[model samples]
Target: MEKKHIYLFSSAGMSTSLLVSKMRAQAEKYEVPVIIEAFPETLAGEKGQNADVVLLGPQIAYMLPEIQRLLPNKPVEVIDSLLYGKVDGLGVLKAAVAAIKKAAAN
Candidate 1:
């Protein structure tokens, strides 16, 4: 399988940095070849260009539409508030993988 590139974006990128670490661990546990990274929303235009999926943290979920417009070809989703608040890495990873699959299917 091709290595999936997932990008997590938020206000400052600090919170998502933790999420990235957790997601990386989850990816290892599931043997999924994925590269996850976190960046501030300001870098979305640049970083998002190479991402398979772009996930917006709950704190910045309001930017979803703008990001979707900026990255029309990429799958952009807002991380669930509850899951994000809990830092549910595996859940977020699963959601991203599913989004990629769904996008590919279409």
Candidate 2:
């Protein structure tokens, strides 16, 4: 499988950085071929355009609509709180992979 590019936009960039690390571990251990990164809203447009999957952290979920509007052709999603509370990397990766497939089919 080709590597998928995923971007995570959040309020506090460092906070999501932690999540990114955890996400990477799961990505490797589970053999999920993906590259994930975290960025602040300031770079959303610039960095977001390079991503195959765009997701917003729970803190800035309100930006979902605008991001979707901005990246109309991309799969823009909000990271749900349930798993995010514990920073479930593998679970989140699963969701994003599913989103990628769904977007590809369309």
Candidate 3:
């Protein structure tokens, strides 16, 4: 079976791609099936729609509501403040899983 995809968006794709690497590591460590990618902030909805989970980096957290509105059926959230500032990949992955689980519940 194919793994679920996760999308991360930020001002520049650079930093978020680094975070994606971290998230990939954590996912591997935990044996979670996931694929993560970073996209430029402006393409949130288009890129996010294909994802099982969509996360906004702090640099573009202001766009959360708009993105959420566009992709109401998918999991959407701002990365945890702690993870965003510290680049804590594992914590962000935890946040991503939690968001997807919560969205699935509703």
Candidate 4:
């Protein structure tokens, strides 16, 4: 299986940084081959180029459409507000994996 690169975007990437750590732990516990990172939404156009899937934090959910437009070939999704609010790492990681598979099928 190809290594999945998951990019997370938020206003300043600060909060998502914590989420990234949690997700990373979960990925390791599950032996999931994924590379996850958090970045400011402003860097999406450039930094997102290598992402297999892009997830927007609730804070930047409004930018989903534009980010999707910018990376038409990549899977783009917005993290669920409730999931994000609670910092559900496993939930978000599963969501990203599902989105990537769905995008691949299309």
The residue pairs in collision within model 2 are none
Model 4, which residues run further than 4 Å from truth? 11-15, 104-106
Clashing pairs in 3: none
Estimated TM-score for each candidate: 0.83, 0.80, 0.82, 0.84
What TM-score number comes out for model 2?
Answer: 0.80
For model 1, name the residue pairs that clash.
none
Write candidate 3's Cα lDDT for 1-106 as tens digits.
5688778887444556777888888888777788887787777788898788888877678888789788877887777555665566787788888887888652
Task: Give the Cα error of residue 81 in candidate 1, in Å.
Answer: 1.6
Better of 3 and 4 by TM-score: 4
Which sequence of candidate numbers ranks them by TM-score, best first? 4, 1, 3, 2
Candidate lDDT values, in order: 0.78, 0.73, 0.77, 0.77
Q: Candidate 1: TM-score? A: 0.83
**After superposition, candidate 2 runs with Cα above 4 Å error:** 11-15, 102-106
Q: Write the per-residue lDDT of candidate 2 for residues 1-106, one digit (tens) a residue.
A: 4887678887544556666677888888777677888787666676778887877778788887788767877876677665665667677777887777767653
Clashes of 1: 0
All candidates: CA RMSD (Å):
2.2, 2.4, 2.1, 2.2
How much lDDT does candidate 4 score? Answer: 0.77
lDDT of 1 by residue, 24-45 (tens): 8898877778898878777777
